[PDB]
Amino acid sequence: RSPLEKASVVSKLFFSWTRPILRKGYRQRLELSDIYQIPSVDSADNLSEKLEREWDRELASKKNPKLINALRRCFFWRFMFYGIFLYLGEVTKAVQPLLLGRIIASYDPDNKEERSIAIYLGIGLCLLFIVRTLLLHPAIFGLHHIGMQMRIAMFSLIYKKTLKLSSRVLDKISIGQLVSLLSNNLNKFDEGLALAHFVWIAPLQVALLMGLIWELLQASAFCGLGFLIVLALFQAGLGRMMMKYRDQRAGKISERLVITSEMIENIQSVKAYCWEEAMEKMIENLRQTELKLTRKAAYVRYFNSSAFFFSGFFVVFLSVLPYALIKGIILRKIFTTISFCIVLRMAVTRQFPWAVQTWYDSLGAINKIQDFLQKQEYKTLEYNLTTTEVVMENVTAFWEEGGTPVLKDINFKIERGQLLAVAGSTGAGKTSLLMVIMGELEPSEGKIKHSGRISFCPQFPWIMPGTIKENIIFGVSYDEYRYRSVIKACQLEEDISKFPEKDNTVLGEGGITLSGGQRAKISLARAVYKDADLYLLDSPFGYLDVLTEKEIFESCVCKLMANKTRILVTSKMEHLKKADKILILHEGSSYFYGTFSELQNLQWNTYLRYITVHKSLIFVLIWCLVIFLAEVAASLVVLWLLGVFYIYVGVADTLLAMGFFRGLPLVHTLITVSKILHHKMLHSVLQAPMSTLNTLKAGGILNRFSKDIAILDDLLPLTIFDFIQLLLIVIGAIAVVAVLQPYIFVATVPVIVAFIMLRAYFLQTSQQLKQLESEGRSPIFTHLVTSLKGLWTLRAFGRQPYFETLFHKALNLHTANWFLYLSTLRWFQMRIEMIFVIFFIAVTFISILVGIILTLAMNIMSTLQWAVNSSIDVDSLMRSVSRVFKFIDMPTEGIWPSGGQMTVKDLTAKYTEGGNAILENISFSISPGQRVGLLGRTGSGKSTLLSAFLRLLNTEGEIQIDGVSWDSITLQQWRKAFGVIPQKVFIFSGTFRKNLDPYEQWSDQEIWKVADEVGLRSVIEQFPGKLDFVLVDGGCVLSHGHKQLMCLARSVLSKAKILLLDQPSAHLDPVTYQIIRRTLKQAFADCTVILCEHRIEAMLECQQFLVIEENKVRQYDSIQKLLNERSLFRQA
């Protein structure tokens, strides 16, 4: 447990509770187990319940609900308490020049105003620093805590809202927009709470400072105020210009995010198609405009950030010269004026615009989140009592809100214990009918009445990340008899037994470990397990062979649940013979409704590697340093004309300030560095081996492409520039001041060496906890992605609270990782402040017990601390560059085809190294121009063989076509001889023409010819733009029977002499399969296809069969030869 729960007031004030973890992490590795727990204040379950109540009251009471009016009622008073503490701690910063000016008047020659007083003031001056230190840091920590609490509460509200979104609203929502929204205010929201209080402190500080200065300059104190007001107007005009270049980049960032995620999810098909070259350019073109906007917005921000270092001369000039004209000036007042003007310049030009910008951004983010919260919701409205019968009459529905209806005049009725089987050609609307039943689709006319309890089995299998037992159970009480019977009747015995961990293995997001014929079985078992009234199954036997389908239908759909009503999407005749009713849709219309009899009768090392990527960075750093060398040599050897050099030193901020000749090129180069880094990282990811790529997850990519690159684009340039500016200011003033007085320069050496040693000591833990928390924010992303993916099988089942609890657990883990760093960085900053005051209690006290050397020592000892803080910020930010380089440094896996004859010798396929060998000593041959038909059971390894042909997985054999082996040619040129049709169809966000070919090498005539040949003429032309419609949501507009057709058209367009057909027809009806056959015969009359289809009527157009069994291949010749040994395959 965290010690903050049980800690004394002084212990919490000194933050001394991070000492044990810091000591452990400095000399040992930090592990998740040895991490402080979470308290009861930061728990999401309570921190969201405290806000949902207020939000609901606002929604039900007000006429114009506001989220800020609900956040105020919770986090107002603590925020105001820390604001008051901040104001009290900052009032003590404008009165420090007053004490220096009332000390200097004492060490004025021959016994000036007060003589026996310097003892009183020389101690109180530095003792006031202790009070400032005590008052400042706790308020900052409290404000950070409040910001983090608001962030987690709003995130939980967003997740609770995102599970009630309608199907209509999901059209405009992409898996990239939400990720970008989270990544924006994931860490820049809670950090800005401290800066938000400087909107009412800066004016009061300005008023107090003006009142103080007026006692020095009678009426000349207002010219400097006028100049500073003009500068503040200029900065406020720069802010609005910067905003315009920030609200246009978000859309491009989201678009790039969705395209990158869609590519990385199924990089397998990209590699098979050899689309990497044409798909890196598609991202580079998008990145160009983002870079242009970022480069335009990184100059205005620099100009805003450089108005403090270029204002320390004009303000002093305008303050002193008008008064010096009428009365001259004294060398005592001319320094108190500068000491006041420094604080005034900071509070006007650095603290006010930052607060204004923070308020603007916070209000904008809150309003955006409120707009997300106020969207259309999904209603159920069903009745929980009936006669256990499902009847709907005269239902007509439109998918799009506006167009052609999808369903019209469909009526049916089924009692309890009956089975209704629906069928029809592709595009008829069977899935839409089941959606109408489920309620995810609102009919425009009609009514559906049935009991609420239903069970769903989607056409596309869904595998949430967890054990097989958890996947099958799906958040209910575990059973031993029902579960075992289901697992036996769904044919999941042998496949589960093959695993080393028998039942509870681990499956990743999407079930990549499992094949395509076992995910369907798991989904069917999950649907069967649930105790519901109606089991609406949407074509469960999609990726199952004929024998498995026959064995499952008679033992799971008619023997296990033969007393509960179930609606099945059929595509065969044996499934209709045993049916109780039949409904044959056609183009969204009830073509038939009746029984089968009537149907029959009817018819360190990162900094050096970061700057050396681009040579212009070195050529600009040398140019920005040698000019500083000349500038500092124009203030050390030209002094023989003067010797009052203290006044000259006092304006070192303006003297050594970077202009627009040495800062603009550096800023411009620092973005080109990020561009090159991102391009190299994307290329190295695209050209990586599959064994290395499979280690990566779907949450480990949006955490490295969305936030990590955004850091390098946005935050690193200006932070590095500011740190460099502070370094130059400190060095070129300490070196100068070491000439006049070399005794006060001595004190700055031990301070610097202690600062560097302590910072390097604390980095030993901040470089392993910061990375821990930066990688610990991936679970929430990877759970949000899958919860959005399974949003239609979640609401149908009813398991919403289970996912809510999972998300709460993930949020708790992230906050537990975050609080430790948020506390240890504060501890180290406060200890730096303490060593500062400890080494400062002596410098003035011993020297006092010239009186103006004190103001220079105090103007240097604060710039040193500011530079130290900037260095800490840069070191914290460079972890992103470190992870970019880690992600780049990855292994690289990298007319001839006339006849197309094959030969394999001693082939071994294994997806991993040292794992189970899927294929062992494979050998066969293929006569050229001869079709070959693969065969086998589920889990045999057909797709494994097809992948081993293209060498996606590591192999140990040789395959040669037309006399050239594997080694004689490169992988990229070898892989171009094959035209594949992957089992997982790939559709990305783009136009139809772009999807059909990314390289854009075929004209619209050539595209239309193939589209009409395959049969997409009636599908492309039903959309507002033919061959120009922007398919989105992963091609969700199309249907499962049209996705396969488009994939086959893509295969036909690209002509190859060898092609690996991996189940060309997955869910196609028998009528549309004639199109597949008329394309196969008339377009593949010269190439040697390798079929994988499970259709018995399709397995007859072959000449050489390959059956995979027990990790070996047997090749037969006659069609009936292989159907005689095993009688099961013939009887089934």
Ligand SMILES: Nc1ncnc2c1ncn2[C@@H]1O[C@H](COP(=O)(O)OP(=O)(O)OP(=O)(O)O)[C@@H](O)[C@H]1O
């Ligand atoms: N990424 C992977 N890593 C390790 N093993 C895998 C991976 N993908 C699949 N397998 C294993 O491969 C075995 C069989 O190979 P594959 O997954 O290609 O199935 P298959 O027999 O071709 O499938 P089907 O006939 O159902 O389409 C499966 O039992 C599974 O354990």
Ligand SMILES: Nc1ncnc2c1ncn2[C@@H]1O[C@H](COP(=O)(O)OP(=O)(O)OP(=O)(O)O)[C@@H](O)[C@H]1O
């Ligand atoms: N989200 C959507 N928005 C707009 N139109 C859609 C959407 N989903 C499907 N459609 C279209 O509406 C019709 C309904 O097709 P649907 O997907 O219901 O067919 P199906 O019976 O499931 O077909 P299949 O044989 O491919 O499984 C099709 O013309 C399809 O292209």
Ligand SMILES: CC(C)CCC[C@@H](C)[C@H]1CC[C@H]2[C@@H]3CC=C4C[C@@H](O)CC[C@]4(C)[C@H]3CC[C@]12C
């Ligand atoms: C924090 C703010 C609101 C407090 C009110 C403004 C303060 C800073 C201003 C208002 C009037 C000012 C005073 C006006 C006149 C004099 C008389 C002179 O012999 C010493 C300075 C002194 C005493 C000024 C000190 C600063 C002063 C007190």
Ligand SMILES: O=C(O)c1ccc(/C=C2\SC(=S)N(c3cccc(C(F)(F)F)c3)C2=O)cc1
């Ligand atoms: O509250 C804060 O964050 C805070 C408060 C105060 C400051 C002070 C600063 S910054 C800067 S530059 N100078 C300066 C100006 C002229 C000359 C010199 C010299 F002598 F060192 F060269 C240094 C300061 O005095 C920074 C931050």
Ligand SMILES: [Mg+2]
């Ligand atoms: Mg379907």
Ligand SMILES: [Mg+2]
């Ligand atoms: Mg397969």
